[PDB]
């Protein structure tokens, strides 16, 4: 689409992997005037907003918060607190015909002011003065929708550039749209720190014979202690037991007599740490 009829593509319930888009390196620019280019793939939003419009290479800087332009101040403005991001790439590959591609449109003559996020379909003729138009294409009345020509072998400032806006708006609804939560390999029979979706802690991940409910995932005990959970990847019961710990008691005689000691790792089989169990 163009700047005059920029549409909105709002999609909910996404896992938005922006890491592959940041690692693509195929677009012209990726620096967005919002949050930092990193850490955005771990923060969770309610839904993503997408737009579509094209601007020439001479006005690719007019899609930044706090900018002026004859093309941007009447077709698509930026919010005062824009926190999302804007991606643009060189569109002079498949959308630029010879003699001037007049498919896309644009509008530069408007008497009223434009507000951020305001898509208008104003097609009526505009008056550049005080005399009324009364339906004429003569003096003091110009048609706002002019021909957005695309010269295929012109300067960079005239080449087409497909621009998309990805606003990261937050509402009162719970956050749903966020990216990848990567996992690791499975560790068995070792005191390791687990990073499950619901629980985070340390323990030994072993197998057991108890079977959970088809909808139940986690599991507690009598005195509110976790005993076993279900692996999110493969449906299986993993017994979570606290790894071996205890207290060291040094049994030593009088230091005036000798200087030898004998440690005692309490309540441990001491296969995990003169041996006499």
């Amino acid at each position, epitope marked *: 689409a163009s700047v005059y009829a920029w549409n909105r593509k709002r999609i909910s319930n996404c896992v938005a992997d922006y890491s592959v888009l940041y690692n693509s390196a195929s677009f012209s620019t990726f620096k967005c005037y919002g949050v930092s280019p990193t850490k955005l793939n771990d923060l969770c939003f309610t839904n993503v907003y997408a737009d579509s419009f094209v601007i020439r290479g001479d006005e690719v800087r007019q899609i930044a918060p706090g900018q002026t332009g004859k093309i941007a101040d009447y077709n698509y403005k930026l919010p005062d607190d824009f926190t999302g991001c804007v991606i643009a790439w060189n569109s002079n*590959n498949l959308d630029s*015909k*010879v*003699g001037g591609n007049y*498919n896309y449109l644009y509008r530069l003559f408007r008497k009223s002011n434009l507000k951020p996020f305001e898509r208008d379909i104003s097609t009526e003729i505009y008056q550049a003065g005080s005399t009324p138009c009364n339906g004429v294409e003569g003096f003091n009345c110009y048609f706002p929708l002019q021909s957005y020509g695309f*010269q*295929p*072998t012109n*300067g960079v400032g005239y080449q087409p550039y497909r621009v998309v806006v990805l606003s990261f708006e937050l509402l009162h609804a719970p956050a749903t749209v966020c990216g990848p939560k990567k996992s690791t390999n499975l560790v068995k029979n070792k005191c390791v720190n687990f990073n499950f979706n619901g629980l985070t802690g340390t323990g030994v991940l072993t197998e057991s014979n108890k079977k959970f409910l088809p909808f139940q995932q986690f599991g507690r005990d009598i005195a509110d202690t976790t005993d076993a959970v279900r692996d999110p990847q493969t449906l299986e019961i993993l017994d979570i037991t606290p790894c071996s710990f205890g207290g060291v008691s040094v049994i030593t005689p009088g230091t005036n007599t000798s200087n030898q000691v004998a440690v005692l790792y309490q309540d441990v089989n001491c296969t995990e740490v003169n041996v006499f169990q």
Partner: antibody, heavy 120, light 108 residues
Framework: QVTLRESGPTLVKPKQTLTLTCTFS??????????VGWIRQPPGKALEWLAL???????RYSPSLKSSLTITKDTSKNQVVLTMTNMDPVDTATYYC????????????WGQGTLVTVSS | ALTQPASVSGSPGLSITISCTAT?????????VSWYQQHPGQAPKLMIY???KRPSGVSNRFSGSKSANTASLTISGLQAEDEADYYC?????????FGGGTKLTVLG
């Protein structure tokens, strides 16, 4: 994917209507950038572009024979007809059906070459 | 007007330069240049599609780039082979011109 088939009558009369049907398959005139066109080239001479049918039904013509150059398309039959009206005696050349796949790739696909002579 | 010399032939295995003219304001920026290679009796083959990058169909030692305002396809490795007619092509402000042609032969 490259099934360019150049057809049309070779021996035509002076000041007649030339018909060049270029049948193809695979790529069609739906994706932007893809554009079929004809290139005029006399035997042993250089090349020159005459018509270029684009995906948006744009009939781009050349100023050399702007008054007499006309070309249509058919997305269903996958056949593009070049209607060169008022065939002059000097218009004897070898037409070549090509396909502008993109703006940078200038006429990737090329046909075989059909010689068209004009006389009485 | 992509005017090209008639026939600039040279010794086999030499990087002979093929040139066509400046292609002034009638041609906007000279950013879409595609050299051709038309064998006698067959269809022309595309040796390059962009200023520097060549297509994937006839990927060979056919290299070339535009320095200031003219393009030159320099062939050094795969030169001792068949010969044909070269054609530099580009778009103008409103039309598409092919210019003349360079019937480069293999002298010797």
């Amino acid at each position: 994917q490259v099934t360019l088939r150049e057809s049309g009558p070779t021996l035509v009369k002076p000041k007649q209507t030339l018909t060049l049907t270029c049948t193809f398959s695979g790529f069609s005139l739906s994706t932007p950038g893809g554009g079929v066109g004809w290139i005029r080239q006399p035997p042993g001479k250089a090349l020159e572009w005459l018509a270029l049918i684009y995906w948006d039904d744009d009939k781009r013509y050349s100023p050399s024979l702007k008054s007499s150059l006309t070309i249509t398309k058919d997305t269903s039959k996958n056949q593009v007809v070049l209607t060169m009206t008022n065939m002059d005696p000097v218009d004897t050349a070898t037409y070549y059906c090509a396909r502008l796949t993109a703006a940078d790739t200038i006429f990737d696909c090329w046909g075989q070459g059909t010689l068209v002579t004009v006389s009485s | 007007a992509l005017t090209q010399p008639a026939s600039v032939s040279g010794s086999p295995g030499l990087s002979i330069t093929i040139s066509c003219t400046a292609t002034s304001s009638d041609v906007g920026a000279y950013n879409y240049v595609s050299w051709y290679q038309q064998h006698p009796g067959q269809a022309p083959k595309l040796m390059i599609y962009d200023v520097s990058k060549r297509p994937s169909g006839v990927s060979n030692r056919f290299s070339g780039s535009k320095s200031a305002n003219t393009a030159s396809l320099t062939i050094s490795g795969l030169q001792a082979e068949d010969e044909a007619d070269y054609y530099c092509s580009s778009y103008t402000t409103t039309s598409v011109v092919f210019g003349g042609g360079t019937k480069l032969t293999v002298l010797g």
